[PDB]
Design a protein around this ligand. Structure first.
Ligand SMILES: Oc1c(Cl)cc(Cl)cc1Cl
Ligand SMILES: Oc1c(Cl)cc(Cl)cc1Cl
Lengths: 219, 219
């Protein structure tokens, strides 16, 4: 039996750093108003098979796009996302703009996700195919790290538009279209069928389904 | 064995997400001007022994504070850091003040570092000791994630002052002293003695030793 109003359960959500930054603030009001002793922990993605973390209960929900989670896994598709490019407000390419070749000759920072089997790996692969190897100056596993490096140096960064907009709304980056075609991605929450009937998991699942991920955090 | 002006070597630096965000932008000018094909990859901290990653050449340099790195390891202490608290400018306790009692009754997000054996674990331990368990609403392994969440919710975040001051520029955090006695920490670069004589490693270490970590990134 799980009662949100009195529980002190610590829920663990596996997600990229941006996924955590997107999710947790949108849980705050719900926690404050209805589950004041419930704790939520964001857990970084690891190389091991995520399905086993979900099966054992060491992760309650995975939040992201995880193409290799299937067998033994239930899902709810939360939203669809598209990629854009960002550069800092004082980037010298802004004076005359970029055609596709000038883009390829700029310096880039890449977020790598193939080691975590996160759907961003599809974009990573396309960028690695597109770009001259010497054009790639930085690599990182974390989205927020790459965004703040783009604010402080002349590197181009290709990222989900929700992440881009968060920084653009604060003044630090400007957004422009990716000059090649990239897939859109589906972001979902995932749980193991072993916990499909668990009252705590069900509660968190349903809370997440109520979240508006295109809007500011409530309250 | 190594010439920076022509090298296409990919150096891997292990660090917290803030450490990566601190380090890489401060390498950019050096790379642009003296080593245009050298790539730098920020690598997240992991639960396994970091000494083995340095030993195997899997990581070139570790950057941060790692109290369990010793046998087989050479270090250079780069700077000392102290902690502060941040809260968003629209947080209620802003006016009241942040006395210890009011601090304890606020909601907190804690950056957990003990699993990575990073020196922030010392501050983590002090907070967990003083705060009631119901005061801790969120946990994350990522400093930048926690800063985004503090910017967007009424949680209090206790962090290195260099992260706080820089992060408070955009968006709107207010910095407070922590009403707890906290140690300062030493930030160092770490390498394995096996690569003490590797010319590529030597070059990168000396570049790092010339960085002003108290100043903005060059350019
Ligand atoms: O991991 C992600 C999540 Cl959960 C959401 C978005 Cl929009 C992007 C990423 Cl990379
Ligand atoms: O990992 C860190 C580094 Cl490398 C530098 C500072 Cl100032 C703080 C942290 Cl948490």
């Amino acid at each position: 039996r799980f009662d949100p109003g009195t529980s002190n359960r610590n829920f663990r959500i596996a997600a990229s750093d941006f996924g955590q930054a997107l999710m947790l603030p949108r849980l705050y009001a719900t926690l404050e108003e209805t589950a004041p002793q419930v704790r939520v922990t964001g857990v970084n993605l690891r190389h091991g098979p995520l399905v086993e973390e979900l099966e054992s209960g060491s992760i309650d929900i995975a939040f992201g796009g995880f193409p290799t989670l299937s067998a033994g896994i239930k899902t709810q598709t939360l939203f669809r996302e598209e990629y854009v490019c960002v550069m800092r407000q004082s980037h010298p390419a802004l004076t005359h703009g970029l055609d596709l070749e000038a883009f390829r000759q700029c310096r880039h920072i890449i977020v790598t996700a193939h080691e975590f089997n996160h759907v961003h790996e599809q974009v990573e692969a396309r960028l690695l195919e597109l770009l001259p190897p010497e054009s790639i100056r930085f690599t990182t596993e974390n989205f927020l790290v790459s965004a703040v490096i783009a604010e402080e140096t002349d590197v181009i960064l290709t990222i989900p538009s929700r992440l881009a907009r968060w920084f653009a709304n604060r003044g630090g980056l400007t957004i422009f279209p990716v000059p090649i075609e990239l897939p859109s991605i589906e972001v979902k929450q995932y749980w193991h069928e072993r916990y499909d009937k668990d009252p705590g998991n069900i509660w968190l699942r349903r809370v997440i389904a109520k979240i508006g991920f295109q809007n500011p955090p409530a309250e």
